[PDB]
């Protein structure tokens, strides 16, 4: 575990992370996809061997010795708000299990279901709160990656609020 487990936020490409493993915002079929998933495919393509997994689950595939945790959030275009909320919570619980099993001291993680799976809604608070519910009992350093300047400020605020 980390000596003083922390949360941090960085605004940059998660393919350039400085952590011991990465969480991919994957699709259920293990396809290259777009956004975070396409960046992850360009950096760690070997990790997409047999990466297909259902909504609400995470499946880890090694790229060399570097673990890529494929976490499948719901597409809110297809799920009801209620069922989507349950699947998004479940995907993060499976990420916490994998991070624990791998014995890493740090993990790079995007906000699941906030991009093309958001069904056109701002889900920063919803996705971040499910991330915290899952990861708070882990002792890995968690570094959250985003691309938007206003999202960076809001995520940083939410982390600092609890400190």
Q: Which residues bind Cl ion (CB under 5 A)?
A: 12-13, 115, 117, 146-148, 151
> Among residues 101 and 153, whose Cβ is nearest to Cl ion?
153
Query: In the complex, which residue's CB is closest to Cl ion?
Result: 115
> Among residues 13 and 66, whose Cβ is nearest to Cl ion?
13
Annotated ligand binding at 115? The verdict is yes
Annotated ligand binding at 95? The verdict is no
CA atoms within 13 A on the CB side of 142: 25
* Nearest distance in Å: CB 45, Cl ion: 19
* Nearest distance in Å: CB 88, Cl ion: 10
* Nearest distance in Å: CB 76, Cl ion: 9
Annotated ligand binding at 78? The verdict is no
Annotated ligand binding at 13? The verdict is yes
Q: Which residues are annotated as a binding site for ADP-D-ribose?
A: 13, 27, 35, 115-117
């Amino acid at each position: 575990g980390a000596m003083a487990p922390s949360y941090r936020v960085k605004r940059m490409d998660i393919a350039k992370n400085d952590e011991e493993c990465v969480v991919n915002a994957a699709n259920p079929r293990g396809l290259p996809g777009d956004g975070v998933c396409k960046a992850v495919y360009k950096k760690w393509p070997e990790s997409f061997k047999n990466s297909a997994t259902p909504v609400g689950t995470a499946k880890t595939v090694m790229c060399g010795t570097y673990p890529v945790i494929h976490a499948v959030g719901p597409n809110f275009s297809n799920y009801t708000e209620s069922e989507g909320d349950r699947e998004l919570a479940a995907a993060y619980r499976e990420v916490a299990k994998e991070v624990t099993r791998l014995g890493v001291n740090s993990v790079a993680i995007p906000l699941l279901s906030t991009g093309v799976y958001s069904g056109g809604k701002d889900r920063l608070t919803q996705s971040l709160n499910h991330l915290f519910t899952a990861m708070d009992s882990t002792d890995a350093d968690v570094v959250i990656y985003c691309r938007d300047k206003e999202w960076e400020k809001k995520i940083s605020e939410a982390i600092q609020m609890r400190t």
